[PDB]
Amino acid sequence: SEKNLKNINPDYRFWIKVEGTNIDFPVVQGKDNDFYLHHNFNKEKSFSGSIFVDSENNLNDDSNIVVYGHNMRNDTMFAQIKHFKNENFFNANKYVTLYREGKKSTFEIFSVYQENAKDLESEIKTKFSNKEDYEKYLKEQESKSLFKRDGIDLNSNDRILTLITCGYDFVNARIVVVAKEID
Numbered sequence: 001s002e003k004n005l006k007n008i009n010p011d012y013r014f015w016i017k018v019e020g021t022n023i024d025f026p027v028v029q030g031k032d033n034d035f036y037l038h039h040n041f042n043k044e045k046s047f048s049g050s051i052f053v054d055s056e057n058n059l060n061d062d063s064n065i066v067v068y069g070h071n072m073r074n075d076t077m078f079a080q081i082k083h084f085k086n087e088n089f090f091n092a093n094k095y096v097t098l099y100r101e102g103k104k105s106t107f108e109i110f111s112v113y114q115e116n117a118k119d120l121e122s123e124i125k126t127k128f129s130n131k132e133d134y135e136k137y138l139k140e141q142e143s144k145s146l147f148k149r150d151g152i153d154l155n156s157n158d159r160i161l162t163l164i165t166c167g168y169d170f171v172n173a174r175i176v177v178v179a180k181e182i183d
Contacts, residue, residue, distance in 0.1 A: 084175070
């Protein structure tokens with residue numbers, strides 16, 4: 001199954017499902033963060049692209065796994081990420097699930113926020129010098145959340161997942177959801 005996928009495209013890395021949403025897709029890694037904006041999972045060019053993980057992510061090492069997706073308002077790709085801007089939806093919907101080499105991992109969402117695309121590009125980090133900067137980065141992501149997730153106990157031992165898609169409230173808006181690995 002995961003093998004089949006890996007065949008149809010070797011850039012495949014994992015499956016993702018976001019609780020509360022129809023997001024339930026394979027995720028691919030390109031050599032950059034442009035290819036898969038403009039090409040589907042068969043690599044055929046396409047307006048809607050694919051879900052991709054940051055091309056500089058080392059999935060084994062990195063403290064923050066960054067995944068990007070189109071929002072074109074039509075219930076495809078990361079479109080429904082928009083619901084997390086709703087306080088009630090946020091309270092009720094909590095978990096993102098990655099399946100990778102036969103293995104399921106679960107992450108609890110603790111932050112949602114919107115931001116200018118360039119601003120965001122310069123803020124988002126996959127790599128970290130040392131534990132203090134990581135901790136500092138974690139507190140900033142949490143502190144930016146539109147809503148508090150109770151009892152989350154965010155610290156420098158955690159591993160996180162960050163999801164980024166288009167927003168429409170202002171020009172070049174991006175919406176961002178951050179989640180911490182649990183269990």
